[PDB]
Design brief:
Chain B: The active site is at residue 58. The structure is cut from a larger assembly and holds two copies of chain A. Chain A is an alpha+beta fold. Chain A is 31% helix and 20% strand.
Chain lengths: 1105, 67
């Protein structure tokens, strides 16, 4: 068949936004498996505390990929990342995705989980129908094929832990047998549903330590890790960059095994490896580094390593490097193969092997490790040379294996064309992207393969990417320039300038460009008979060299033909052409109605006939007088030679009349300047005397006329007579009349559409100002050459870049010799350079959504928000306050009704506490709350034992009258003395209540215990417990009393806010009053009636001895 | 060397059997994961060829036949 290669690569592996970060983490040894709470609160369900996780799933360039925003929200994160990764991978190998469109490229994607499918399909009534299009596991490949327009197979394999490598093998078989010319293999795995981790833990595969300590003595399990890698495999003919070559790939299934379905088999693996390396024709001694599966399982590792020992380490002398990428990033279950491939390819690219983390004591059951036949990559070792291997063994019993031959094309020897400046163009979604591409390119102004690859992938329509930019590398000056490209296809026009534009050594810089040199050499051949060498004339430095007309005309023609050819190489076909006097012939060539030799001969003979005539001296000058006004002002013998512009006109005649008129006009102040005719009358009656000989010569020169096209507008024949015989064909007669006839240039301009791009194909943009003045303001102009410039090649490249920014697509790579392929190794990766538009956040499933009656876990860890409960100590053991029960039930009711706590005035009735829940010092206790909205009753339970019962309901009509402070039991205590905080809590300690700082909220209390002032630290539990403390304070009953029943409680947060007040300090306080006659405790906005406390046993064990 | 290609597009039983975290038995993932739909057959019948489960969006069966 045909060789198959790994053209591209891209992905987002753990703690890496692009493969560049992946390599930076790998070589730097930084462990990529973290211990954060991103996917779900750590330590849940006993699950391993550590796992590998990506950095951000909530980003997706929706608009570019044509997904309407509503369906963007309801698309699996895997597919959203995979579209971006696949696009990045294709452009990594410098292949424009539009090229593959219409081909039979396939998309084999290995996905083992569809967790998001359940997430978006758990609420039947309000579930949207889009989910199936973007979540069904089959759409993983179909979506890619649909966006990129791939007509090849579209599958989605499911073998676990080996789906990615199986997909790669299938793609290899497809391309190898000639069915498909390109393939996009990829794998995706995202950890969202913790139940899957719980399943794996129950099976015993996961390692509690959360480290895949590959090959070590203490191998336990593997840490789940998530990544999304994609790879583009194409035939050797279409490849731009070849990371490696896939010599062979195959797979087989374990079949029956005594131990069980989940016990890996070594004999089958050895057979697979031997069969592959024998069938492919690769010598066993050739292998260098084999990326063993290295799952870290106590069983799998010895089996696989012994299999590799038998398959390759049998009869070779040099040790065989063995490594595992899962020791860094963990184990991406279905994407394991592609992650290992990415590591291998990066190591080959950079010339080192990434070391393996967590390898201290080698395992004894694998003899090869101790005898040295296999060597683990403990440190970065330089790559030596030879073939490479890879193998992933999914636990279902599906084994795969791939042989890779690294790409080792050496950098080309330096060439002269490397010295010359190069042009670069990049395109992207946002300006940051264009700047990134240009900066990275400028950082490699010498890697020609890199520059050519970048130029290739820059051809994208404006709508897809609305920002472009160009940067000239190696030039004496000129920075990057990035500007947004307005929407819409824009026309391109060529304008060829006329006489006077010649200068000393004009175009000498362009001769270094091969195409231009070929053009000029052909011209030199074409003009041989008359003794003039276009190249010789260009090189000649004599200032007088361009005094003769013949040289000027021939040189102008030659340079313009060269420029038209240089543009012609890029694939640009002009839509309109409008020349000016001589050099309209250049336009004639541009259209195609004339041959290069024909045009050059016409120019030369025109010039020569100019000399032979020997007409009287005559000067033409530009007169500010308009075309209408100037003509009637023209004196005898002088007429309007060229209607260049409304503001600028040119008129010629005898030198003396011209000088007199110019001086008179300067007296009148109007513009006037003599054009460098050299003394030869231009576009006047003087040229009339030449026509007969000129007509004879031209009839000689052009013998088989051709028809002028509708593109080029004859600026010599007036618009009226465009149906004449002369206007039809640019025959000798046409050029003769053009020579004699005046220059109606401005009039021809109007037909330029709006927004069109004008090019001044000429050595010196003398007319650029004229075109600016006399053209629609929406147009864009470009010189392509400027007089006496430092390096005209730089200016031409800058012009091509400016043309690129203006909408058209003129790839500059073609200007220089094509770069040999495949790209030499070491060319920096292009995938990291691409930057997307991630200014919007798209939804991702949460832990709550996945299935697993309010439950409240109380944790007293210092970080826990309920740590304040550690200060509610009664008789030496922490107890959950009754007000805590009230608060949790209140929050549950608020959630039921939809309101917030501070806007939900509540009433409790017939509240009964059954048993006191003891918060343990370590761990947590779960509390369950159930409401019965119909019966206005609630109930709290713990482990299935009732803890509190009663009635709670919303307060329909709050009454602030209720919280007015009741008449004091003692109207006139008349006692200036009062208890302070320290005395209050001293008394409560003596009784048996041991309260900590948080619950100490009684700033003062009256001696009788009827009135006081309570603190308000913004916590209802503390406030109401302080109220109960006040109630207990005046009790004459020594002993520990705890609440058991509260008849009714009323809370109105609005009155609570209106009752608070602030002291001299910044602390807030609320007054409290207790009335034993009415059995009421009113404080802030809390009303408590009918309390009842029962003497606790007060017996505590381990009393002080 | 016989192989197995199974066209499957649903694993609802897996969703059902993973509903409870506290009481989910490990061996459920051996007998409900999509991959096992082919690996179990390969295991019982002792087939050393390829083992694949492919969705392909409603053409899974005729796709498997083509493979």
């Amino acid at each position: 068949p045909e060789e198959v290669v790994i053209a591209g690569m891209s992905g987002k592996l753990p703690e890496s936004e692009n493969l560049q970060e992946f390599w930076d983490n790998l070589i730097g040894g930084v462990d990529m498996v973290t211990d954060d709470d991103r996917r779900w609160k750590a330590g849940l369900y006993g699950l391993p505390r550590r796992s590998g996780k990506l950095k951000d799933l909530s980003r997706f360039d929706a608009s570019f990929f044509g997904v309407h925003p509503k369906q963007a929200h309801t698309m699996d994160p895997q597919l959203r990342l995979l579209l971006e990764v696949t696009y990045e991978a294709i452009v990594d190998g410098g292949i424009n995705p539009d090229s593959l469109r219409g081909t039979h490229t396939g998309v084999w994607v290995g996905v083992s989980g569809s967790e998001t499918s359940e997430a978006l399909s758990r609420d039947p009534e309000t579930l949207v129908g889009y989910s199936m299009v973007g979540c069904q596991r089959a759409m993983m490949a179909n979506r890619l094929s649909f966006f990129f327009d791939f007509r090849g197979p579209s599958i989605a394999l499911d073998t676990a832990c080996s789906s990615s490598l199986m997909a790669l093998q299938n793609a290899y078989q497809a391309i190898h047998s000639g069915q498909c010319p390109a393939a996009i293999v990829g794998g995706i795995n995202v950890l969202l549903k913790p139940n899957t981790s719980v399943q794996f833990l129950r099976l015993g595969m996961l390692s509690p330590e959360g480290t895949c300590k590959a090959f070590d003595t203490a191998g336990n399990g593997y840490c789940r890790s998530e990544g999304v890698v994609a790879v583009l495999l194409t035939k050797k003919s279409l490849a731009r960059r070849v990371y490696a070559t896939i010599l062979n790939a195959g797979t087989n299934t374990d079949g029956f095994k005594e131990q069980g379905v989940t016990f890996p088999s070594g004999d089958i693996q050895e057979q697979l490896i031997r069969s592959l390396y024998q069938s492919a024709g690769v010598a066993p001694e050739s292998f260098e580094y084999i990326e063993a599966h290295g799952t870290g399982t106590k069983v799998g590792d010895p089996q696989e390593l012994n299999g590799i020992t038998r398959a390759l380490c049998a009869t070779r002398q040099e040790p065989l490097l063995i490594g595992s990428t899962k020791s860094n990033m963990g184990h991406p279950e279905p994407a394991s193969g592609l992650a290992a491939l990415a590591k291998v390819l990066l190591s080959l690219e950079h010339g080192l092997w990434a070391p393996n983390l967590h390898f201290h004591s080698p395992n004894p059951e694998i003899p090869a490790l101790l005898d040295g036949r296999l060597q683990v990559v403990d440190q970065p070792l330089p790559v030596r040379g030879g073939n490479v291997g890879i193998n992933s063994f999914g636990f279902g019993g599906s084994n795969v294996h791939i042989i890779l031959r690294p790409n080792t094309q050496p950098p080309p020897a330096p060439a002269p064309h490397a010295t010359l400046p190069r042009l670069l163009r990049a395109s992207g979604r946002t300006p940051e992207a264009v700047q990134k591409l240009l900066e990275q390119g400028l950082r490699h102004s010498q890697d020609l393969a890199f520059l050519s690859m970048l130029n290739d992938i820059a051809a994208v329509p404006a709508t897809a990417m609305p920002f472009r930019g160009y940067a000239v590398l190696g030039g004496e000056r000129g920075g990057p320039e990035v500007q947004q490209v307005p929407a819409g296809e824009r026309p391109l026009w060529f304008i060829c300038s006329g006489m006077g534009t010649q200068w000393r050594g004009m175009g000498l810089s362009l001769m270094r460009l091969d195409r231009f040199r070929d053009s000029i050499l052909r011209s030199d051949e074409a003009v041989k008979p008359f003794g003039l060498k276009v190249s010789q004339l260009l090189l000649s430095t004599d200032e007088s060299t361009f005094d003769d007309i013949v040289h000027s005309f021939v040189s102008l023609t030659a340079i313009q033909i060269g420029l038209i050819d240089l543009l012609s190489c890029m694939g640009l076909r002009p839509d309109g052409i409008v020349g000016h006097s001589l050099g309209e012939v250049a336009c004639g060539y541009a259209d195609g109605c004339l041959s290069q030799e024909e045009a050059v001969l016409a120019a030369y003979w025109r010039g020569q006939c100019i000399k032979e005539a020997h007409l009287p001296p005559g000067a033409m000058a530009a007169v500010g007088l308009s075309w209408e006004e100037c003509k009637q002002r023209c004196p005898p013998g002088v007429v309007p030679a060229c209607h260049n512009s409304k503001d600028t006109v040119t008129i010629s005649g005898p030198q003396a009349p011209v000088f007199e008129f110019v001086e008179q006009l300067r007296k009148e102040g109007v513009f006037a300047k003599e054009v460098r005719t050299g003394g030869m009358a231009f576009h006047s009656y003087f040229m009339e005397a030449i026509a007969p000989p000129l007509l004879q010569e031209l009839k000689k020169v052009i013998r088989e006329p051709k028809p002028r096209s509708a593109r080029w507008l004859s600026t010599s024949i007036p618009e009226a007579q465009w149906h004449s015989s002369l206007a039809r064909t640019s025959s000798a007669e046409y050029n003769v009349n053009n020579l004699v006839s005046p220059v109606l240039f401005q009039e021809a301009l109007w037909h330029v559409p709006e927004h069109a791009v004008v090019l001044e194909i000429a050595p010196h943009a003398l007319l650029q100002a004229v075109l600016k003045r006399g053209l629609k303001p929406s147009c864009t102009i470009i010189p392509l050459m400027k007089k006496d410039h430092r390096d005209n090649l730089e200016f031409f490249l800058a012009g091509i870049g400016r043309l690129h920014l203006s909408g058209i697509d003129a790839n500059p790579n073609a200007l220089f010799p094509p770069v040999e392929f495949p790209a030499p190794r070491g060319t920096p990766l292009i995938s990291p350079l691409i930057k997307w538009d991630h200014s919007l956040a798209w939804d991702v499933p949460a832990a709550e959504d996945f299935p697993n009656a309010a439950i409240y876990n109380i944790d007293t860890s210092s970080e826990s928000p309920d740590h304040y409960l550690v200060d509610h100590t009664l008789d030496g053991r922490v107890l959950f306050p009754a007000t805590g029960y009230l608060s949790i039930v209140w929050k549950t009711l608020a959630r039921a009704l939809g309101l917030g706590v501070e806007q939900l005035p509540v009433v409790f009735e017939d509240v009964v506490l059954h048993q006191a829940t003891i918060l343990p010092k370590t761990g947590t206790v779960s509390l369950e709350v159930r409401l019965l909205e119909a019966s206005r009753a609630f109930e709290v339970s713990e482990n299935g034992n009732l803890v509190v019962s009663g009635k709670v309901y919303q307060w329909d009509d709050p009454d602030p009258r209720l919280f007015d402070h009741p008449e004091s039991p003692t109207p006139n205590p008349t006692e200036p003395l009062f208890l302070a905080q320290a005395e209050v809590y001293k008394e409560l300690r003596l009784r048996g209540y041991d309260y900590g700082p948080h619950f100490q909220g009684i700033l003062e209390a009256s001696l009788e215990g009827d009135s006081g002032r309570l603190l308000w630290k913004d916590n209802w539990v503390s406030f109401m417990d302080t109220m109960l403390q006040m109630s207990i304070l005046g009790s004459a009953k020594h002993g520990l009393y705890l609440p058991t029943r509260v008849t009714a409680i009323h809370i109105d947060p609005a009155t609570h806010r209106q009752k608070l007040y602030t002291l001299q300090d910044k602390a807030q306080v609320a007054d409290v009053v207790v009335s034993r006659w009415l059995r009421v405790t009113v404080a802030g906005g809390v009303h408590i009636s009918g309390l009842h406390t029962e003497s606790a046993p007060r017996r505590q064990q381990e009393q002080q001895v």
